[PDB]
Amino acid sequence: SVYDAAAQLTADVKKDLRDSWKVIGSDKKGNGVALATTLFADNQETIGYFKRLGDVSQGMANDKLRGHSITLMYALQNFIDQLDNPDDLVCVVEKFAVNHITRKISAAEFGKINGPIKKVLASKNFGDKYANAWAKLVAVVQAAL
Amino acid sequence: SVYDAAAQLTADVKKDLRDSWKVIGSDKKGNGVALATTLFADNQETIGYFKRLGDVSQGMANDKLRGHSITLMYALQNFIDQLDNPDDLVCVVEKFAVNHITRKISAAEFGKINGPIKKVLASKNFGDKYANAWAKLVAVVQAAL
Ligand code: HEM
Ligand code: HEM
DSSP states (O other): OHHHHHTTOOHHHHHHHHHHHHHHTTOHHHHHHHHHHHHHHHOGGGGGGOGGGOOGGGGGGOHHHHHHHHHHHHHHHHHHHTTTOHHHHHHHHHHHHHHHHHTTOOHHHHGGGHHHHHHHHHHTTOOHHHHHHHHHHHHHHHTTO | OHHHHHTTOOHHHHHHHHHHHHHHGGGHHHHHHHHHHHHHHHOGGGGGGGGGGOOGGGGGGOHHHHHHHHHHHHHHHHHHHTTTOHHHHHHHHHHHHHHHHHTTOOHHHHGGGHHHHHHHHHHTTOOHHHHHHHHHHHHHHHHTO
């Protein structure tokens, strides 16, 4: 199933993911925080999962939130690095899903991250072409939830 | 405390961490698996915490072990990347400590990774000077457990 979702990651999709990540991943703290705060802004209900982070309205200045946002970017870094080897991509995605499954985060709930990603990409001038490529990567993760 | 331990990362310690990581981090899968397998071999008592991974002796052939090993290296990548900013290093270490605290991994238990790190470093011609620098970084995590 995850192997099948990974099949949608064509040469063109992997190329756009890599090119866009070259920029997005160059500032993990700034964009990581951008992603997290955008998620909470567009889907306030997702905040229910982050009680531990405390006052998320503080954004960047919130040490726990900042700590989570930076760390989040390294999971994406991991995924991008494994793109050329489906066997490694799959084992890394399934490993990643373990804790999110335990948190009872469904594929549908996880899919809510697509909006914030599209926005973060757009702030760096990466159009729909790139947003669609990223949604396909997220779909691989969704297949594991 | 974690804030006092982070202050122990002096100029040269950070430099040695970077120079050695430049090589060790070049092959996250190979070195990540070597690190994990060495831990289980030298400290079989720690295998109990990794029941979900299955037969850990299969090494590279064990998909779950390979997934965990690769992912492990990205946490180290994170720490190295935050060396410039103590505030970020700390929030990233505290974030990392959460799940390990939940598994009841004590500071003394975590410290068992020092052996495997020393050996992997040694396999790449990096001596005690470097093993000691890494022990200091590990001490930062131990302070948060
Ligand atoms: C592309 C999107 C995402 C990435 C790359 C990502 C990455 C991560 C990483 C690396 C961690 C730390 C390791 C762990 O505990 O699993 C984490 C923690 C967590 N994630 Fe995800 N995640 C994503 C989306 C989501 C979404 C959509 C939710 C829920 C609506 C979610 C909820 C959580 C929670 C609650 C934690 C624990 C936070 C804490 O207490 O520090 N994640 N995630
Ligand atoms: C250099 C040291 C280490 C690093 C960088 C590291 C890294 C990680 C990462 C990134 C994860 C995935 C996220 C999470 O679930 O928290 C993890 C999982 C885990 N770690 Fe650590 N860890 C280290 C040492 C240890 C040690 C020494 C133990 C215990 C003796 C330990 C026990 C665990 C366990 C049981 C898991 C879950 C494995 C699974 O079910 O997939 N870790 N660690």
